[PDB]
């Protein structure tokens, strides 16, 4: 539950730049694939559990 955005998945540190005024990331299918940690500002990938 990252600042209200809820979901299930496995986190993973990514190499993406997130335009620091942004918080969430989405793919083509509008699925949340990258969420920023609101406490340490790093970007984490969202992958569905196997």
């Amino acid at each position: 539950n990252f600042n209200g955005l809820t979901g299930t998945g496995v986190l993973t540190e990514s190499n993406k730049k997130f335009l620091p005024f942004q918080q969430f990331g989405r793919d083509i299918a509008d699925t949340t694939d990258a969420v920023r940690d609101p406490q340490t500002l790093e970007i984490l990938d969202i992958t569905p559990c196997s």
Binding site: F21, Q22, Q23, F24, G25, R26
Partner: peptide, 26 residues
């Protein structure tokens, strides 16, 4: 206290591709 010391005029022009902003923080 204020006084009317500006009274600026107005005109018209063509606004090209401008005024685009980020709709969300996605």
């Amino acid at each position: 206290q204020c006084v009317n010391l500006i009274t600026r005029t107005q005109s018209y022009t063509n606004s090209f591709t401008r005024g685009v902003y980020y709709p969300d923080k996605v």
